[PDB]
Structure formats: C-alpha cells, structure tokens
Design a protein around this ligand. Structure first.
Ligand SMILES: Nc1ncnc2c1ncn2[C@@H]1O[C@H](COP(=O)(O)OP(=O)(O)O)[C@@H](O)[C@H]1O
Lengths: 50, 380, 69, 158, 53
C-alpha cells in the first residue's frame, strides 16, 4: 500500500474553511453573482412606471 | 419539549441581525429585548459579533447565571453523592435538570456533555427518546449540521424503531434537517405534510410557521399535478391560508397560473425567505426553480408564444423576460429555443416516447459508466 | 403452481371495498350503540400504534347477538 | 322592548337592558334569562353597531357570570358564536365554540349542543374545512335526535 | 355555495362548449374557436389552457 506520491501531490494549503460545509449540491448556475431577484423585479417595476 | 424553542427564536434573531445588514435597527431592538432576558451571557460569545462585546447588564446577569448554575450543581452533587440512586431512579431526572440548567442558562458545551453523560448512562426507552429530542433541538439551535445529522441518523435507525406514536411527535423537526438544507424537493415534503404536531404551537415557533414551511417546501416540490387533491383539498391547509392572506395569495396565484400577480408575490416570498434562517437555496431554489416549473408549465401546451405578449402576461419588461428565458435555457431547463430575429419562443417538447427515450439513454450512459467502473474492480 | 387469489375459490362474497354502498352517517339506525363499533373500527383506523405505548389491549372479536333490527 | 324593536332604537334599548338588572335578579331564573335573550336578540337584529354589539354582549356575559346564571351565560356565548359566524370571524369563534362544548358536554343540554355543533359545522364550511364540518355535522345529527319536533331547528340541520 | 357553484357551473359550460366543438378540428385557429363560442380571445385561450395543463 503506497500513496503514489511520485505524481505531484500539491495539497491544498488553505486549510481555512469549507465553502459548502453542508450537504448542499451546487450547480453551474447556482454560483452566479447578482442582486438576487427581488431587487431586479423592483427595478423592472420602476422602469415600467409602477 | 418547550425549552430550546425560545432559544430558537433568539438564534433566528441573531441571524436577522448578523447576515442581513438592512435589518440593523429593528434587529438590534428584538435581539436586545430577548438577550437581556433568557440569561444570555454564556450564549453571548455568538452575540458579541453583531452588538457590543457585552450589553450593560454584566454584574447583575452574571450573578444570576452563576447563582442559578451553582444551585443546580449543588442539587446534582447531593443526588450523586449522598444517595446511591442508580439506573432506574430519580438520578436520571436529576441529571436532566442538570442538562436543562446547562442548556437554558449555560452554554451548549456543558449541556452536550451532560446529555452525552446520561445517554451513555441510561438506555431506557423513554429516557433515550427524550434525550434524542433534546440533542436534535440543541443541534438545530446552534446550527451544528454535524450534530443534526448525527441525532437524525441514530433516531431514524434504531431510536425511533423502539417505541411508536412518538415518531409522530418528532418528524416535524426530524425533517427540519431537510428543511434547513437544500433537499426541500421530495424527501422533505413526503414526510412533512403530516399535520400531527407534538404541541399546538411549539418546536418550529408556531403552527403557522409550520404551515409556511409546508407551503415553501411544497412549492419547491411540484407545480400543478393533482395537488388540488394533495394540499388544496387539505381542510387545515385552506383554514391556515385564510389566516394568512398573503400566503394564500401566491399559493392560489401559482395554482391559477396568473403570472401578473405571481411574480410580485414570488418576490415577496423570496424577501420573506431572506428574513428566515432557512435560506440555504440563496441563488438556486428561491424563485428560479419555482418559475422554472412555472415557465415549463406555461410553455408546455404551447408551441410558439411571442416574447412580447408572454412578457405582459408574466409581468412587464419584455427585455427582462427575454434575458430571464435565455439565462434559464442556458441553465438547462425550459425546453425551448428563442427565434431572436422574429422574437418568438419555439418550444421543443419531446413526445412521451421521445422524452422517455432520452431518459433511458441518459441512464444508459450512467450505468455504462458504472459497469466500466465495475469492470475496473474485476481483473486487478 | 399456486393460485394467489383465494376469495373466488368458493365465492362466499369478495372484496366489497372501494365501493360506497352505505357510507356511515346515512344509516337510519343512528347509533344503537355504534361506539363499540367505532371502537371496533379503531384498529382498522390505524391506532394500532396507539394500541401500544398507551398500553391498551384493543378488542379483536366483536359479536353482535341481535335480530335483523 | 317591543316598541323599541319596532321603531329600531339602539341606545334606548341598550340603556333599558343595563337598567333592568335589579328586576332580572328578583324573579324566576329561567324567565329572567329568556327575557334577557329576547331583548338581546331584538337589539342585535336591526341596528348594526359592529363595534358595540360584541362588547355589549360580552359585558352581559360577564354580568351573567357574576350572577352565577350558568345557563344564561352559556346561551349568550352561543349567540356570540352565531354573531361571530355572521361577522365571518376566523378562529375566536372556534375556540369559543370549543369552550362551550367542553362546558356543555359535561352537562346534558341538547338544544344548545345542536346549535353549537351546527354553528361549528357552519364556520368549518365558511373556512372550507369540509372533513371537520362533516364530522361536526354527524355529531350534530347524533345530538339532534333528542328533540322530536324542533320545527326551526330541524330545518337548520337539513 | 352561491358564487362558488355558479363559477363551477360556468366552468362546466365552458368545458362542454369547447369539447363539443373541438372533435372535427385536428388544428384550428383559436380566434375561430372564439367566434363560434361568441367570446373574446384571451378568456377562451385562458380556459382552453387551464383545461389542457
Ligand atoms: N339506513 C338503514 N338503517 C337500517 N337498516 C337498513 C337501512 N337501509 C337498509 N336497511 C336494511 O337492513 C337490512 C339488513 O338485513 P340482514 O343483513 O338480512 O339482517 P342480518 O344482518 O341480521 O341478517 C336490509 O334488508 C336493508 O333493507
């Protein structure tokens, strides 16, 4: 039993936090950055006049 | 089971003061009004982050904590030293009073130590059920998802097997693990529509709050199969929507498929979920998943619905719906394409044969990956 | 081979379930007692879990020694 | 009281009801109790002071409780359950009906129980609580078998 | 049980009228369907949708 350290074993040097520390399953679209939807709908209501 | 429920309230108040900075004036008031009470000094190492390091009650409040904790500690010492009561005796409840003092007054560390001590000491059915409930409640208090999973695993495995008619008193918070997590789609609802509460208004802060969780979970679950015969037929469901008109408003809006009021109410739902510590689907399943179900419901039974008219039938801002459709198609759902040169939504709904055959070839891909992995397992 | 169905071997009636003939409160006899009968239906109406814990021993056989009344 | 109802007066009838209390506690309990009920029903009939009808009757119930006329105060509680259903009250009518049922089932009244159960069935239907309405209605029938010819009540059940 | 049943009955006639006039057509323009039913376009489209969802 060997760990195959011959291949470059660059362990992740952060050791600070787990971003998804829980069992949450992420998606490619789930991690986009926006002001959610409530603010966007408010802006949509404003540009239409109400 | 009443304890740790007002503790849940202060935990939610700390959430409302910490994560959303918009609530920084009223959140301070409710946090202070419930932290000067309830003896929040040991449970104030978390509270010091938002407000000052310590509110100006230090001398009086700490004396109350130390005196109360010492009195219970003296009581515990008397039972465990002067009397040799062991096993099935009153020492079991004496250590429950110790754990209650270390939980309701002291920090969670002492309460957890007291719990784990008597859990390993006595394994009686009633005692084991009560402590599992307390461990779950303190776990959902301090947001230790590891502790919530641990108590849920043992309870669903062996603890709930021994003893019945108490699982009906526990699933409402045993499924809270799925409620706080992303899994609000299938497993949550299937074990959470049960309207058998262990108390009239407790655990999840109310029966009304219990319903709001039911409505949110059901809305994430499904769009419009015979849900009229699943939740709408529910008499207690109709009654509580009479109690909450706004909650009744969007639930009927989704049922009636009237998008003009739905989106405004859906945004209100997302804003309400923002003020709730069960905010895990922050960018996935507040409004995007529900409208994915709604848009799928809308564009199905349609072939080419114009962007301009579907925009006014689903709010305003033709460009806003156009960019929303493009984003969601790129996400994968909303099975359709956009004819930009003519501004048309040409859907592509596969037939019952076509869509299902697509599902089989996908599962064929996954299982070929499985058997190839198993072919790796053999011959080595 | 073994036959799964058992009711039709000698007829003697069959599954009368899933068919509303006389629902419940529509009976003209009101109660007579009908509380021991609802006690009898407690076991079909789940409550076998409530038979334990609560420590009751639910009834098993109900004999009605009455005329066609 | 008959002329006040005929004319439609409210303040005068309210003052008369608040004034006749010495005479109520000088005669037969049943006769005084039914006189109170008749005057209260006549007052609540025409003039719709929704901000005063509930408060006035609650005061009468408190007065009846002070006089220890249990059957009187129970009757007015049933009347306010009916008034609550008339005003589309959500759940305060429900607990009041539940409180009435607990107080009345220990007794052996029959007319009040049928009215309470029927009112409970009505408010379930108003809140669209069909299965509980059916269960309450079935209990209403089981209680209503006692009265042989309540010509108004039998129509209400039907 | 007055507005609710009248609305329920109104839905019944809408469904019956649509189903009665729909057998011949393999593909019919919806403004023609509205003309036969003597109604507007949005309400007929909304009713026909709610039936088919
Ligand atoms: N609502 C009702 N209440 C009481 N009896 C009824 C009602 N409806 C019908 N019946 C009668 O009850 C009878 C049952 O008869 P039967 O089964 O022969 O009596 P037994 O069960 O004693 O042999 C039927 O013949 C039917 O006419």
């Amino acid at each position: 039993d060997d760990e195959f350290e011959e291949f470059p074993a660059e362990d992740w040097a952060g050791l600070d936090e787990d971003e998804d520390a829980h069992v949450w399953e992420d998606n490619w679209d789930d991690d986009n950055v926006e002001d959610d939807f409530s603010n966007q709908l408010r802006a949509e209501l404003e540009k239409h006049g109400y | 089971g009443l304890p740790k429920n007002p503790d849940l309230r202060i935990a939610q108040l700390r959430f409302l003061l910490s994560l959303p900075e918009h609530r920084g004036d009223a959140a301070v008031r409710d946090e202070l009004m419930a932290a000067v009470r309830d003896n929040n000094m040991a449970p104030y190492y978390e509270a010091l982050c938002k407000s000052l390091d310590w509110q100006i009650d230090v001398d009086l409040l700490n004396k109350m904590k130390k005196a109360n904790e010492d009195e219970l500690k003296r009581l515990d010492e008397e039972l465990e030293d002067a009397e040799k009561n062991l096993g099935e005796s009153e020492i079991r409840d004496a250590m429950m009073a110790k754990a209650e003092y270390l939980c309701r007054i002291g920090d969670k560390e002492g309460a957890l130590t007291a719990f784990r001590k008597t859990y390993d000491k006595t394994v009686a059915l009633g005692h084991r059920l009560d402590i599992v409930f307390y461990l779950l409640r303190i776990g959902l208090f301090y947001m230790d998802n590891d502790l919530i999973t641990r108590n849920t695993e043992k309870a669903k495995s062996l603890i709930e097997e021994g003893g019945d008619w108490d699982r009906r008193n526990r699933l409402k918070v045993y499924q809270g693990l799925y409620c706080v997590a992303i899994r609000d789609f299938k497993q949550a609802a299937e074990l959470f529509l049960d309207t058998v509460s262990t108390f009239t208004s407790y655990e999840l802060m109310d029966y009304k709050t219990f319903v709001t969780y039911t409505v949110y979970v059901s809305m994430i679950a499904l769009e419009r199969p015979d849900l009229r015969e699943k939740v709408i037929k529910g008499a207690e469901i109709l009654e509580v929507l009479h109690s909450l008109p706004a909650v009744r408003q969007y639930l009927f809006s989704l049922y009636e498929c009237r998008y003009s009021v739905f989106f405004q109410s859906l945004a209100v739902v997302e804003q309400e979920m923002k003020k709730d510590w069960l905010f895990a689907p922050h960018y996935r399943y507040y409004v995007r998943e529900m409208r994915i179900h709604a848009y799928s419901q809308l564009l199905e039974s349609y072939r080419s619905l114009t962007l301009g008219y579907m925009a006014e039938a689903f709010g305003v801002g033709v460009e806003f719906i156009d960019q929303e459709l493009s984003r969601f198609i790129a996400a994968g759902r909303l099975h359709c394409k956009i004819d930009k040169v003519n501004e048309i939504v040409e859907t592509n709904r596969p037939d019952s044969k076509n869509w299902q055959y697509q599902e089989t070839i996908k599962k064929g891909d996954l299982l070929l990956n499985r058997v190839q992995k198993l072919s790796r397992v053999i011959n080595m | 081979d073994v036959l799964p169905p058992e009711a039709d071997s000698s007829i003697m009636m069959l599954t009368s379930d899933q068919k509303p003939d006389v629902m419940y409160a529509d009976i003209g006899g009101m109660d007579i007692q009908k509380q021991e009968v609802r006690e009898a239906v407690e076991l079909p109406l789940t409550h076998f879990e409530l038979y334990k814990q609560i420590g009751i021993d639910p009834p098993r056989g109900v004999l009605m020694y009455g005329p066609p009344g | 009281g008959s002329l006040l109802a005929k004319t439609g007066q409210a303040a005068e009838l309210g003052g008369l009801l608040k004034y006749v209390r010495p005479f109520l506690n000088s005669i037969s309990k049943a006769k005084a109790a039914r006189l109170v009920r008749s005057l209260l029903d006549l007052f609540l009939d025409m003039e719709a002071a929704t901000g005063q009808e509930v408060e006035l009757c609650l005061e009468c119930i408190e007065w009846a409780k002070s006089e220890k006329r249990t059957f009187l105060r129970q009757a007015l509680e049933a009347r306010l359950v009916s008034l609550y259903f008339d005003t589309k009250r959500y759940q305060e009518a429900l607990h009041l009906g539940s409180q009435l049922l607990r107080e009345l089932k220990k007794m052996d009244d029959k007319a009040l129980l049928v009215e309470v159960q029927l009112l409970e069935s009505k408010t379930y239907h108003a809140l669209s609580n069909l299965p509980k309405a059916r269960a309450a209605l079935t209990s209403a029938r089981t209680t209503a078998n006692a009265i042989y010819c309540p010509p108004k009540l039998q129509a209400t059940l039907d | 049980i007055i507005s609710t049943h009248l609305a329920k009955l109104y839905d019944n006639l809408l469904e019956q009228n649509l189903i009665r006039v729909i057998e011949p057509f393999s593909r019919v323009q919806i403004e023609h369907i509205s003309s036969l039913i003597k109604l507007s376009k949005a309400d007929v489209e909304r009713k026909l949708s709610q039936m088919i969802l």
